[PDB]
């Protein structure tokens, strides 16, 4: 730490970064809040603080000292942070100079420091104000209370010193300060330009200098040096987000906006920009706009800043300023901002300017505006549709017609002169070929207009598709496409237009390839490839006729592509290839192609891609087509197996099964005709591997997915058939038919949303919704069957689109329909985990500011503990934000109430998040009436609702809030208990309860509140146990009990009061008297009458007949507790009451539907058992395929060289790292596949070996030492770095487990090369600290969980420790001194001692001091014995070699784990010995080995003495003698008591060298 250096000071308590900013035109120093997930992630150059050290000479700075005076300086402003009097005695405020003693501050180290040495960097400091002799502190109150969502936190001063009030130093890159200084310079130049603008005078040379400044700013913003190209044309692939943020905070964008605005404010005029005088001004505006476009690229915050300036963009539009392109970029970047910005007048302005210019670029701007992220925006598309289809704008659009002249096409276009021309399309194309500029321009304009029409019709917007279809016909488009005379680009534009207008329309609908449900009657007696398609062939034949010619066009075009030697050589041909492939994909997905045609098309599509953005996109689309065709093959196989089952059922029972025959048949289908390619499956593999080698990330991901699926055909088909459902019941079949018809009708209506949204359609769909609500069914079993049928139907998707349909608040009929739809979704999710997961998939739609949607979300999350565990803090933030904004009703609170508890289980993190969010929201959300006036208002409302309370009354809302707080209180959660106790005092509850008139529901809520907030407290609060308000509440409880009993005696009673006394009151009293903490209180002697009267009231409650049997039993338990209390609490029972209490003590002392279904289940089971090994063989084939990729490719090829160099495996590893975040399942599968590659080969039986042989022969031509060689190959390809990076940065438990498993498999066998690679990576890389931190933190958490479990008396945290310890042992295997010493001290800034952590883990698992005492048998059980053995083995591996430092550490550690290690040998471990003696023997042997390793080569006697102190000699000798006798009792096992005793004897001798008594005892007879 030195003066003149800058660091960031972070406050741990506030979890905020100190920043200084000009909030209200005046600089304020504060603790800013950040919405970013990581608090440290959010940082600011303004937040940067420069440290200055006071020294004798003002110029001299020297280096900082803890005692030396420190001054902090806001970097951007340069003003020193200072403490000044606050109107919290003093409040921090910046000062211009350090001359004033206000800036001076004193720093106190949080941790001990060496004398007054120089302050270490990145060290915690305690701030204080030496000037005023006070200590600085942070306050929760914000410095910007006025603004919404205040981020700035005020900082005050206190005389006392607080350890919590300390700030941590954080290093700052010099580049950040250099960028801030250069940004201040850039602001200075911008201010010089602004000064010239304000003066209204700028020389020509000065304006040229401004242009040069803009050019330099362009270079800096791009972060790219000049390439000789125009700064306006400057290109940057990815902007620098840090630089963009710096610009935004510096207001350089604001300066540029002001510079653009001022000339037109005149100095310059937009019309005059055409004049040569203001042409340089126009160029300067252009530079500004280009810089803005580069600045705001892919940054929501920069786009937000520009949004406030969007108006000046609108005004500037219509002139040559490139504002069109900049606006299009920003608007495409953000859609929501586009929704705010869009307005019909801007669409009209675009129309007017594009008409005036008559240029294709303006149309291109609109085309870009229409679509974003390849997804159309409905509102903007509708506005543009109206504007374009307006008859007024007919002139701009080019009209087209077809005339015989066997037919030809002519186009008519209008000039700016308003002259109309008409000409043949072929003649235009030929003139463009000749080179006529006018004809080429009109053809390009027409192409752009065609693309504009397709863009309008994007995402099936019928409103304009109708008119566009009226104008353009299918035959015309087909003729234009087929014609070869026209240019390739125009042919491709026709392809796009056809696809977007006609092929995608209402009559066509997407087809799901595999149908889970089937009809038992429909099941064919026999099935072939033709018969499978025959089921829907008729509809296929009818639909084909419309596009039949286009199908042939597609087929012949793809045939031409495959015929061509070079598939994607020509760019112009590639342009049309993309469109044709996309059209084929769309047709296939809509289902026009038959299955045989799809199988034929697979060969061509794969051959095209068999050994630039457009080519990659085409290959991706081909992959998608292959995916769909494989999905269809799956359903064909399912149908074949179903037909087999039906045929066997018919044969056996005309109305014993030949399962062997059926299995023989099914193995054939699972194993020909159905193959995608005619090469035998080789070509698919080669294409997939080549595409994996390809660079494009989506293409590689898809290729990897298909490659993995290619070798798992059998398992997927078995799973699908297990999911298959058959309809055999007539009633359910009729329901299925009705549901199909109703769903198709509803889906058609939702599709024609535009038609039936503004009639009888509304009533029709209300009726359909009610029909589906009836269809849901009654009864749990019936509901489950109907939910299975619904899942098979996929109606849930149609319902989600119905909800997605746009609407306005005024449409009450539509809101009714939405309510019905929500009820139907509720019925779908009712007690169905699968349906609940499906809803979770699309929950993003459900997240809306609507109470009905919130209730539906509550039902979605109902009773799903896994979903609660994976719940999202952002979702919780959304809910609490809605409550803060409105907090109208109890539904938002009820959602959290449901989240709190699931399956009768609690989640501490969820409860803590709820309470923390409540605290952040503050008193406003948590309404109380504690004050007397608020209590009076509550009393008035309670009196008004005394007869009854509304379901949504504000009193009911407050009650529900209190109930949610009680829900948080449940679970004896000490941490949130603290917040609850601070939240509410017992006195307010006492006042409300003791009020003359209190609502019974309010009383139950408060009794429950006390039941958990105070009785269920994990830690004892002295206040409750010293309060006699409990006895006041108990006399009130007796009054209520008397009221209930007298009511039932009078024959008139209130069920609410009865339940109040029965459940909440009884549970609260029972818990209070059960609490051991309450037993400490001795106020029962003062309130002796009260407690005896409470017992009398409970006895009367039990005696009265109205009490229920369950309530009677609960009351009896409570009365037993009250009796144990009554024995010794200065209370004497009356003798008669004691007679009934003695009676109480005595009481306490006292065609066949089911046949077909079961047969199908049995055949499923039998087939699964039959085919189990074949699945394993098929999976194993992939390991060989990955091992030898070259065999697939032809010998001597370029791809052969690439695979021979190991390209495929290295690319797979690198893409695994790249994709760990994008595709978790794919990453995990790849890691497991690498582990399988590493693992040793194994036989698979006769049938499995036959299958493996056949598969390998078809796919590949034929062309421990092996394990070590494979490990070396993987290490060279880079598995070690992949493992290290995954363990370092992954947040996925599965990914971490798989990474550790891969590390263990790599290092297995103690490979010195892998160990050295790990050491080299650890030493060289800068993240070694991060890796060791991850491992050490995991081990520490495992230790903590083990301690918690021991206190209770097996945890994923403890389970994960086993592979970690195995990994450490394997790293230290073969006595690698470098690794053994590295683990102890990795030589970094922070050193983590994994050896001590392992020893402490052993100690805590064994029980520590209690285990030393000798209760080790109680702690050790069959479950943890393996982990104990592994820990001992790891410690032995650490010690052996020997490593003197490790041995000393283990022997001399403060935990005294050597005592536990010796107690392992000495103790009997009786509970485990009785049942499993082998584990006890193994434990003893490993402990003896560790003890011997500890003293392996130590000549000195310290270690031996320390061991012997714990291990007495006589007991040792007794153990040695006992083992030999135990030999005879030995049962067949690997371990031998004789061998164990021999090892203990060797240890005993080595210890005896030092111990004369042990020597004498060891001497035999
Ligand atoms: O991940 P997203 O959607 O971009 O949102 C980010 C984050 O959620 C905050 O909006 C903001 O942090 P603060 O709340 O600290 O401002 C940050 O901008 P920043 O980079 O200016 O912090 C954003 O980038």
Swiss-Prot record:
Segments forming a coiled coil: none
Keywords: Calcium, Calcium channel, Calcium transport, Charcot-Marie-Tooth disease, Cytoplasmic vesicle, Disease variant, Disulfide bond, Endoplasmic reticulum, Ion channel, Ion transport, Ligand-gated ion channel, Membrane, Neurodegeneration, Neuropathy, Phosphoprotein, Receptor, Repeat, Transmembrane, Transmembrane helix, Transport
Keyword Cell cycle: no
Sequence positions that bind 1D-myo-inositol 1,4,5-trisphosphate: 32, 34-36, 241, 245, 248, 299-301
PTMs per UniProt: Phosphorylated by AKT1 on serine and/or threonine residues.
Membrane association type: Multi-pass membrane protein
Cytoplasmic topological segments: 1-1565
Subcellular location: Endoplasmic reticulum membrane; Cytoplasmic vesicle, Secretory vesicle membrane
Subunit structure: Homotetramer. Homodimer. Interacts with TRPC1, TRPC3 and TRPC4. Interacts with TRPV4. Interacts with SIGMAR1. Interacts with PML and AKT1. Interacts with IRAG2 (via coiled-coil domain). Interacts with CABP1. Interacts with TMBIM4/LFG4. Interacts with CEMIP. Interacts with TESPA1. Interacts with TMEM203. Interacts with BOK; regulates ITPR3 expression. Interacts with BCL2L10. Interacts with CHGA and CHGB.
Disease: Charcot-Marie-Tooth disease, demyelinating, type 1J: An autosomal dominant demyelinating form of Charcot-Marie-Tooth disease, a disorder of the peripheral nervous system, characterized by progressive weakness and atrophy, initially of the peroneal muscles and later of the distal muscles of the arms. Charcot-Marie-Tooth disease is classified in two main groups on the basis of electrophysiologic properties and histopathology: primary peripheral demyelinating neuropathies (designated CMT1 when they are dominantly inherited) and primary peripheral axonal neuropathies (CMT2).
Function noted in UniProt: Inositol 1,4,5-trisphosphate-gated calcium channel that, upon 1D-myo-inositol 1,4,5-trisphosphate binding, transports calcium from the endoplasmic reticulum lumen to cytoplasm, thus releasing the intracellular calcium and therefore participates in cellular calcium ion homeostasis.
Name of the protein described by the UniProt record: Inositol 1,4,5-trisphosphate-gated calcium channel ITPR3
Originating organism: Homo sapiens (Human)
Gene that this polypeptide is encoded by: ITPR3
Boundaries of the shown chain within the full protein: 235 to 2074 of 2671
């Amino acid at each position: 730490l030195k003066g003149g250096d800058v660091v960031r000071l972070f406050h741990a308590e506030q979890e905020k970064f100190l920043t200084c900013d000009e909030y209200k035109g005046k600089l304020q120093v504060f603790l800013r809040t950040t919405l970013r997930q990581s608090a440290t992630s959010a940082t600011s150059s303004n937040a940067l603080w420069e440290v200055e050290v006071v020294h004798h000479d003002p110029c001299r700075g020297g280096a900082g000292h803890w005692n030396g005076l420190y001054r902090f300086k806001h970097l951007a402003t340069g003003n020193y942070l200072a403490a000044e009097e606050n109107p919290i005695k003093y409040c921090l405020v910046a000062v211009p100079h350090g001359n004033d003693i206000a800036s001076l501050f004193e720093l106190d180290p949080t941790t001990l420091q060496k004398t007054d040495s120089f302050v270490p960097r990145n060290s915690y400091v305690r701030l204080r104000h030496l000037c005023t002799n006070t200590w600085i502190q942070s306050t929760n109150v914000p410095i910007d209370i006025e603004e919404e969502r205040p981020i700035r936190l005020m900082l005050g001063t206190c005389p006392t010193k607080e350890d919590k009030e300390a700030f941590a130093i954080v290093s700052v890159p010099v580049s950040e300060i250099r960028d801030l200084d250069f940004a201040n310079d850039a602001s200075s130049m911008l201010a010089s330009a602004v000064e010239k603008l304000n003066e209204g005078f700028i020389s020509q040379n000065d304006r040229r200098f401004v242009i040069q400044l803009l050019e330099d700013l362009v270079f800096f913003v791009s972060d790219v040096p000049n390439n000789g190209q125009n700064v306006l044309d400057i290109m940057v692939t990815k902007p620098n987000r840090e630089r963009q943020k710096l610009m935004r905070e510096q207001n350089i964008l604001k300066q540029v906006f002001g510079i653009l605005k001022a000339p037109f404010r005149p100095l310059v005029r937009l019309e005059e920009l055409s004049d040569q005088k203001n042409a340089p001004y126009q160029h300067m505006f252009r530079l500004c706009y280009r810089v803005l476009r580069h600045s705001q690229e892919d940054y929501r915050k920069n786009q937000e800043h520009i949004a406030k300036q969007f108006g000046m963009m609108q005004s500037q539009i219509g002139y040559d300023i490139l504002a069109e392109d900049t606006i299009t970029a920003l608007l495409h970047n953000n859609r929501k901002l586009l929704e705010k910005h869009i307005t019909k007048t801007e669409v009209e302005t675009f129309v007017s300017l594009v008409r005036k210019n008559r240029e294709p670029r303006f149309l291109d701007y609109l085309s870009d505006l229409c679509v974003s992220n390849h997804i159309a925006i409905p509102v903007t598309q509708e506005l543009i549709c109206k504007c374009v289809l307006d008859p007024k704008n007919s002139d701009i659009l080019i009209r087209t017609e077809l005339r015989p002249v066997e037919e030809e096409v002519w186009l008519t276009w209008t000039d700016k002169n308003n002259e109309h021309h008409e000409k043949s399309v072929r003649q235009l194309a030929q003139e463009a070929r000749a080179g006529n500029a006018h004809d080429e321009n009109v053809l390009s304009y027409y192409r752009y207009q065609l693309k504009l029409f397709a863009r309008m019709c994007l995402d099936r917007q019928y409103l304009a598709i109708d008119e566009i279809s009226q104008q353009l016909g299918v035959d015309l488009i087909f003729l234009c496409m087929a014609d070869e005379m026209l240019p390739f680009d125009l042919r491709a534009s026709f392809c796009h237009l056809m696809l977007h207008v006609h092929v995608d329309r209402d009559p066509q609908e997407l087809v799901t390839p595999v149908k889970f449900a089937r009809l038992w009657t429909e099941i064919p007696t026999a099935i072939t490839i033709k018969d499978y398609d025959s089921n829907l062939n008729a509809s296929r034949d009818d639909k084909k006729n419309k596009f039949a010619n286009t199908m042939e066009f597609v087929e012949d075009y793809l045939n031409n592509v495959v015929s061509e030697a070079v598939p994607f050589a020509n760019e112009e041909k590639n342009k049309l290839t993309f469109e044709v492939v996309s059209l084929a994909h769309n047709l296939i997905y809509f289902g026009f192609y038959s299955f045989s045609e799809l199988l034929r098309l697979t060969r061509t599509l794969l051959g095209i891609i068999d050994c630039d953005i457009v080519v990659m996109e085409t290959k991706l689309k081909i992959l998608e087509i292959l995916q769909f065709i494989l999905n269809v093959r799956l359903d064909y196989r399912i149908s074949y197996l179903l037909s087999v089952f039906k045929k066997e059922f018919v044969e056996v029972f005309p109305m014993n099964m030949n399962l062997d025959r059926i299995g023989e048949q099914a193995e054939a289908m699972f194993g020909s005709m159905l193959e995608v390619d005619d090469e035998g499956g080789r070509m698919f593999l080669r294409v997939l591997i080549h595409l994996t080698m390809h660079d494009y990330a989506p293409l590689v991901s898809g290729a990897l997915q298909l490659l993995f699926k290619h070798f798992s055909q059998r398992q997927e088909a078995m799973h699908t058939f297990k999911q298959v459902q058959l309809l055999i019941s007539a009633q359910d079949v009729e329901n299925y038919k009705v549901i199909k018809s109703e769903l198709d009708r509803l889906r058609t209506m939702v599709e024609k949303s535009e038609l039936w949204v503004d009639s009888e359609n509304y009533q029709i769909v209300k009726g359909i919704l009610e029909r589906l609500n009836k269809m849901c069914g009654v009864g749990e079993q019936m509901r489950k069957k109907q939910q299975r049928l619904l899942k098979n139907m996929d109606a849930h998707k149609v319902m989600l689109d119905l909800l997605q349909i746009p609407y306005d608040k005024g449409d009450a009929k539509m809101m009714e329909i939405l309510r019905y739809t929500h009820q139907f979704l509720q019925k779908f999710c009712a007690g169905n985990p699968g349906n609940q997961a499906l809803l979770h998939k699309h929950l993003h739609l459900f997240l809306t500011p609507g109470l009905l949607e919130a209730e539906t979300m509550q039902h979605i999350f109902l009773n799903n503990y896994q979903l609660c565990s994976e719940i999202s803090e952002p979702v919780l933030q959304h809910f609490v934000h809605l409550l803060a904004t409105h907090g109208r009703h109890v539904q938002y609170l009820d959602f959290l109430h449901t989240v709190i508890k699931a399956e009768g289980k609690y989640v501490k993190k969820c409860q803590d998040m709820i309470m923390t969010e409540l605290t952040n929201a503050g008193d406003d959300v948590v309404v109380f009436y504690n004050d007397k006036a608020s209590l009076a208002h509550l009393l008035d409302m309670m009196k008004a609702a005394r007869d009854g309370v509304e379901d949504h009354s504000p009193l009911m809302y407050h009650i529900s809030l209190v109930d949610l707080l009680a829900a948080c209180a449940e679970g004896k959660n000490v941490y949130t208990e603290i917040k609850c106790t601070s939240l509410l005092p017992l006195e307010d509850v006492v006042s409300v309860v003791t009020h003359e008139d209190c609502i019974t529901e309010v009383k139950m809520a408060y009794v429950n509140f006390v039941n958990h907030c105070y009785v269920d407290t994990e830690v004892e609060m002295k206040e409750i146990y010293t309060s006699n308000h409990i006895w006041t509440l108990f006399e009130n409880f007796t009054l209520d009990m008397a009221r209930v009993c007298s009511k039932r005696e009078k024959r008139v009673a209130d069920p609410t009061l009865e339940k109040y006394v029965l459940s909440v009151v009884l549970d609260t009293i029972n818990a209070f008297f059960s609490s051991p903490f309450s037993e400490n209180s001795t106020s029962l002697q003062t309130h002796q009458t009260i407690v005896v009267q409470l017992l009398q009231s409970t006895t009367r409650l039990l005696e009265c007949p109205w009490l229920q049997q369950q309530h009677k039993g609960s009351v009896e338990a409570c009365i037993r507790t009250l009796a144990m209390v009554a024995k010794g609490r200065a209370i004497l029972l009356p003798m008669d009451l004691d007679a009934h209490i003695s009676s109480m003590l005595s009481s306490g002392a006292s065609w066949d539907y089911k046949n077909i279904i079961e047969k199908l289940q049995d055949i499923i089971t039998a087939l699964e058992e039959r085919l189990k090994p074949l699945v394993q063989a098929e999976l194993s084939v992939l390991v060989d395929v990955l091992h030898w990729p070259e065999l697939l490719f032809l010998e001597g090829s370029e791809a052969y060289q690439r695979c021979e160099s190991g390209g495929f495996l290295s690319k797979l590893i690198q893409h695994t790292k790249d994709l760990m975040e994008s595709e978790e399942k794919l990453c995990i599968k790849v890691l497991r596949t690498l582990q399988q590659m590493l693992l040793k080969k194994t036989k698979y039986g006769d049938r499995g070996n036959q299958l493996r042989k056949m598969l390998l022969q078809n796919y590949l031509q034929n062309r421990w030492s092996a394990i070590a060689a494979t490990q070396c190959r993987l290490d060279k390809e880079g598995a070690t770095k992949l493992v290290c990076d995954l363990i370092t940065s992954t947040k996925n438990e599965k990914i971490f487990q798989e990474s550790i498993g891969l590390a263990i498999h790599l290092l297995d066998g103690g490979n010195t090369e892998i160990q050295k690679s790990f050491h080299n990576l650890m030493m060289s890389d800068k993240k070694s600290e991060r890796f060791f931190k991850v491992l050490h933190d995991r081990m520490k958490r495992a230790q903590q969980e083990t301690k918690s479990t021991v206190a209770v008396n097996m945890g994923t945290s403890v389970l994960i420790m086993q592979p970690i310890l195995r990994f450490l042992q394997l790293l230290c295997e073969n006595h690698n001194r470098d690794l053994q010493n590295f683990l102890r001290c990795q030589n970094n800034k922070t050193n983590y001692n994994l050896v001590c952590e392992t020893l402490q883990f052993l100690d805590i698992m064994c029980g520590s001091t209690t285990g030393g005492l000798g209760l080790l048998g109680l702690y050790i059980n069959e479950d943890n014995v393996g982990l104990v053995i592994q820990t001992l083995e790891t410690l032995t591996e650490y010690c052996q070699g020997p490593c003197h430092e490790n041995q000393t550490c283990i022997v001399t550690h403060e935990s005294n784990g050597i005592d536990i290690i010796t107690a392992l040998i000495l103790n009997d471990i009786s509970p485990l010995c009785k049942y499993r003696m082998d584990l006890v023997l193994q434990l003893k042997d490993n402990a003896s080995k560790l003890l011997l390793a500890l003293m392996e080569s130590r000549h000195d006697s310290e270690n031996a003495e320390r061991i012997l102190i714990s291990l007495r000699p006589q007991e040792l000798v007794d153990v040695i003698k006992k083992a030999y006798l135990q030999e005879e009792e030995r049962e067949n096992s690997e371990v031998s008591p004789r061998e164990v005793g021999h090892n203990i004897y060797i240890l005993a001798l080595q210890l005896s060298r030092h111990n004369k008594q042990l020597q004498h005892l060891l001497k035999p007879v």
